[PDB]
Amino acid sequence: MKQKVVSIGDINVANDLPFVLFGGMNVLESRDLAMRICEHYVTVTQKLGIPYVFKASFDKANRSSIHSYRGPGLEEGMKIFQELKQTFGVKIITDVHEPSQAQPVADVVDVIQLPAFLARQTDLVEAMAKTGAVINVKKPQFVSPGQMGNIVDKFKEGGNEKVILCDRGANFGYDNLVVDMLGFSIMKKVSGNSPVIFDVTHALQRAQVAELARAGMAVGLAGLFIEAHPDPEHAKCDGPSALPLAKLEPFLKQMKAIDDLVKGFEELDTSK
Amino acid sequence: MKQKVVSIGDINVANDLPFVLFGGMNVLESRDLAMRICEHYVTVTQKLGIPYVFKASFDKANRSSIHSYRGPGLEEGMKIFQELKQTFGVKIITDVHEPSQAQPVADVVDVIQLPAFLARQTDLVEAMAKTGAVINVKKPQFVSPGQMGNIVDKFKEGGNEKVILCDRGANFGYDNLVVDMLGFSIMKKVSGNSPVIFDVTHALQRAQVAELARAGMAVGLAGLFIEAHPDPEHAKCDGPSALPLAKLEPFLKQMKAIDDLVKGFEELDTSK
Amino acid sequence: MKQKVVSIGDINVANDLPFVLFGGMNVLESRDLAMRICEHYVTVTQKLGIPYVFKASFDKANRSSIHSYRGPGLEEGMKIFQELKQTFGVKIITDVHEPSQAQPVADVVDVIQLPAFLARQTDLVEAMAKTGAVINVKKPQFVSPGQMGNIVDKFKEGGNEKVILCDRGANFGYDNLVVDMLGFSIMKKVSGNSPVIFDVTHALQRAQVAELARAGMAVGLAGLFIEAHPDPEHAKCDGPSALPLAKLEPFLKQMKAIDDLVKGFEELDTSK
Amino acid sequence: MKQKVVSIGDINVANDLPFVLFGGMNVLESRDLAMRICEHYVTVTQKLGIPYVFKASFDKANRSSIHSYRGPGLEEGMKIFQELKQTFGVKIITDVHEPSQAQPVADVVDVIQLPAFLARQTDLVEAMAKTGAVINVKKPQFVSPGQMGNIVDKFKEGGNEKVILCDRGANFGYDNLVVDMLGFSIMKKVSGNSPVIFDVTHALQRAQVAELARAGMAVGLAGLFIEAHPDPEHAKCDGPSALPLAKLEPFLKQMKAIDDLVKGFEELDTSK
Lengths: 272, 272, 272, 272
Hints:
Chains A, B, C, D: It is an enzyme of class 2 (transferase). Helix content of chain A is 35%, strand content 14%. Chain A has helices at residues 31-48, 74-88, 99-106, 122-131, 148-158, 183-189, 209-217, 248-263, and strands at residues 53-55, 91-95, 111-114, 135-139, 163-167, 170-171, 177-178, 196-199, 223-225, 228-229, 243-244. Chains in contact: A-B, A-C, A-D, B-C, B-D, C-D.
C-alpha cells in the first residue's frame, strides 16, 4: 500500500517520506519577533535538512475574554506573511475562521488550516474547498479517529482533494488530553492514506514536549506541527504549550534520527 | 443562596423554580409537521401545567455531506417561526451560527441558542451579546463544567447578562457520551447560579431517554431540553436521538412528579 | 418482564420493589461506635419504613501503608457482628478477601460482599460460591456494565444463584469517577434481571452525596449502599466518602419519595 | 539525575541503560511449546544482543468460567520452569496470586510479578516483600501514574527495595485502553527513579503491536514485556494479544534501533 502525496509546492508531504516539520509560532504578535522565529527555524532546517513551513495565526476567534487582543486582523495579517515569505524562501500556513477569509488567504499562503472546533462546519468546509489550496485538518479532541474519513470526503466532494490530518490528542476526563499513538494508523486507513501529522505543543495544552514528540515520530508520521517562543516563561499565557526556541536544533536533531531511521524500515506485519 | 432568574417573557427560568421544558424538534422540515409537533407539546403542557418554549433549527451548518439539506435558510427559516408563534401563544428558540443571524433572529424569537462547537467563538459571543435577548449556552462535551464560568463572563462583558447553561453530557472515550449528574451543581456555582438545563436527547446521541431524564430532574434543574418526532423509526437519521412524540404526556408526567416533588425539599446539607 | 428476587431472609431485594437500603459503616472500629451507627439507622428505618441491612468491614486488605490498621481480624471481626445482630434484629453484610473467610462468615452474616478489585478472582468466586448465601458483587470502575453477565454466570455455575450487582461508578480519566446512570439498565439486562444497587459513598471516593443519590434512585434501583460516620470531619481519612450520620433521616426521607414514587410508574416505552 | 538499578543477577534493569526485554509467553501450556517459545527468544536475543528474561504464568486465577483450565498448578508449575532455566541459561519471571506462592516461587525464579488487580493488596504486598527477590509491579488501568509512589513505598517498608514498574495502559471509556506515553516520565519521578517497562501485548488487550511498541521505546524505558505464540490465529483466545513469534527478530531489531539510538542522547531540557 502506497501513501498519498499532497505537495505544497516543491515540498512533498506523505506518510512513507521523511517527515515535514510544520514548525512556527502561535499568535502573530510583531515582525521583529516573527521573522526572528523564522530565523532559527529556517536556519536549523537547511542546516539539518528538514522540509519547513512556517506557521502563525493572524487572529484568535477565541481566548478568555472579549476586551482581548484579536490579532493583526484578517487584512493586516496577510501583509505580515507576505514579507517573510520573500525574505526566506519558505511557505506559510495559517488558520481561517470565516468562509470569506478562505479565498483571500488562499492567494498569500501555501497551506491553509482548519480550526479544530470548526472541523465539522460544512458552510466553511464547502467554502475552503473552492481554493483547492493544500488544507490541514486539525482533529478535534472529541472526535474518534475513524470519523476522520467523512471530513476528508465532504472536502473532496466540494472540490479540494489535497488534505492533511493533524492529531492534537483526545479528551481524557475533564481538562486533560492524551495522545492515542494508535490513532495515526487508524487515521491513515479511512483517509485514503492521506498525510498524518502530530501536533505536539497543542497536544500538551514542559520537559515533556520532547519525550512525547519522540513516541509520535517512531510511529511513522508525515511530519510535525510545533510552536516555539523566545521566552516560554513570561509570555507564558494559555492555549497550547510552546517550545523553548533555542532548543530547536537539539530537539529537531532527535526527530531526524527517528523520522529517518524509522521511515527506512522493511515493512513489518505483526498481523500474521 | 438564592437562584438567578432569566425570564424570557412571562416565563421564569430558575434553579429553585418548577422546571421549564424547552421541548421541540430538531431540524425545521415543513409546517404541517412542525406546527403538528407544537400541537401535542402545546396541548400536554397546558393540560399538565408546564412552562413551554418550542425549539427548532432553521439550518444545519454541519451533517455528513455537502450536497445535503442545509435547511429552510436563515431568511425562509424566520418566516416559519413567525406563524406558529401567533398560532399558539408560545415562545420559540433557535440556534445561530454566523454573527449576522444573531440580530435578525433576535427580533423573531424569545430564546437564542449557541451551538456547542461554537461555545468558545468570541467574535460570535460578542456578536450575539448585543441583542441582549435570552441566551442558551450549549455545553461542549469536551469542556469541564467549572470552565463554564468564563463563557458566562465573556457574555456579560459584551453586554447580555441573561444566560442559560445546557448540559449534553461529556466524552467517554471514543464515540460515547456520559452525563455527569454532578456537573449541574458545579455548573451552578461558577455561573452566578444561572439556570441550568439538561439536554437529554442530545446527551443520548432509545428506551433510555426516560430513565436518564429521570435522574437529571431528581437533581434539581431549571428545566429540560427535548426533541420529538412523529415516527422516530424512519426519519431515523443521525445527530441526536428524539422522543416518540406520542409518549410526550406519559413521559412529561414523570418529570413533573420529579421536578415538583424535588423542587420542594427542605434544603439539605450533607456537607456537615 | 418481571424482576429477579434474592431474599436475604424476610427481606426481598428486587428491581420493581421498594429499594432496600444496605446502609452501614466502612471499617469496624469499636462497638460503642458501631452499635451506635446501627442505632440511628435501625431507628430511622422502622420510623420511615425501609428494609435495612447493616454493613461494616472487619478488615482492610489495602490502605496506604503496611504498618497500618488491618482491622479487628477475621476471627475477632465475626464476634463483633454477632452481638449487634441479636441486639437489633437486622442482618449484617461484610466483604471477604481470601477463599477461607467465605464459609466462616457465611454462618454469621446474611449478605456476603465481593471486593471490586477481586471481582474477577475465580478461585475466590468458585470459593464464595459454595456458601450459597446471598452475594453482592461490587462492580469495578474499570469494567463495562455488559461485562457483568459473565461474573454472574461463573457464580451460578459454581452453585450460588442468588447474586446482587453494586455500581460504584466508572473511571473518568485519572483519579476520577463518574456514574453512568445508564449502566443500571444495561446491568439488569445481562444479569437475568438481577437486583441492581447503587453505591453512592464509594462512587464519590461532600454536599454532593445527596444530589447524586437522588438521580440514581429516580432510575429505579433495587436499593442503596451507603456509609455514615458520627464526625465526617476528623476521622476524615481516605477511601470512600461517608454521610454525616445525623443527616440520615432527612436524606433517607428524600430517597423514599423517589424509590416509592418511581417504583410505582406505569411502565413506559420510549422505545417506540 | 541518575537512574535506579535493580539487577536480577548478571542483568541490570535501569532507565538510562539499554532496554531489558522481559519477553515470553502467557499461560504455561506444555513444554514442547514453552521451551520452543524460549528457543526463538533465547536465540534472537544473543544473536542481536538483548538482555532476556523468559516469562510464563503457571496459573490463571481468572478467565471466563469456573470449569476452565486453571493451569499447571502452583506445584507442577514450578517444576516446569526449573528445567528450561538450566537448559538455556536465562531467568524466569512469573506472577503470584496468594501470599503463600510468594516464598515457594522466590527460590525458583529470578523475577516475581504482581498481578495488576492485586496491585493494592497489602496482605500480599507485605507477603511478597519478605522474599526480597526482584519484583515487577503491573500498573492497573484504573490507577493514575503518580499513585505508583505509594505502592513502591509499602513494599520498601515491608523489606524488599528492588522493584520494577510495568505500564499496560489506561482505561479509555468502556472496554478500551490507551497508553499515556507521558505516564512513564511521571512514573519515574515518584518511584525514586525505579525502572519503568512498557507491557505492549497486555496494553493491546494486531498489526499495531509494532507501531505502539516503537513509540514506547522512543520515550526511554527500562525495557519491554512481550508475549508471543507460534500460531496467534487458532489459540486466539482472550486476555492480552500476542506477537506472531516468527516476527520476533525483525520486530526486536526495530526496538534496538530505538532503545539504543535513544538511550544515547545528550540529555535534553525543553523545560527552559
